[PDB]
Amino acid sequence: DCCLGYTDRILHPKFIVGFTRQLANEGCDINAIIFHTKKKLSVCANPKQTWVKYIVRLLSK
After folding, report:
1. Buried b (16+ CB within 10 A) or exposed e, 37-53
2. Measured CA distances, 48 to 6, 7, 29, 38, 39 (Å)
3. 57 by DSSP, 3-state: which?
4. Sheet with strand 42-45: strands edge to edge
């Protein structure tokens, strides 16, 4: 259950209903933002990307 890398497919804000964080010091070797959909389809994203931070920002508003 660790993200081993990041999606390079588009992250569509309208389909994303929340996220979970993966930290490189809790079991897994890299940090990741895991977005998920209504369907609970999950996708690994790069925490350092501006677009990822933005969506996280949008969910928290």
Report:
1. eeeeeebbbbbeeeebe
2. 11, 13, 16, 24, 26
3. helix
4. 16-22, 32-37, 42-45
As a residue count, the chain comes to 61
CATH of 1-61, one of 3.30.70.20, 2.40.50.40, 1.20.970.10, 3.40.50.970: 2.40.50.40
Kindly calculate the radius of gyration of the chain based on its CA atoms and give it in whole angstroms.
11
CB 11 within 8 A of CB 45: yes
Alpha carbons 21 and 57: distance in angstroms, whole number: 14
Structure token pair of residue 16 = 């994303």
Resolution of the experimental model, in Å, one decimal: 1.7
From which experimental method does this structure derive?
A: X-ray
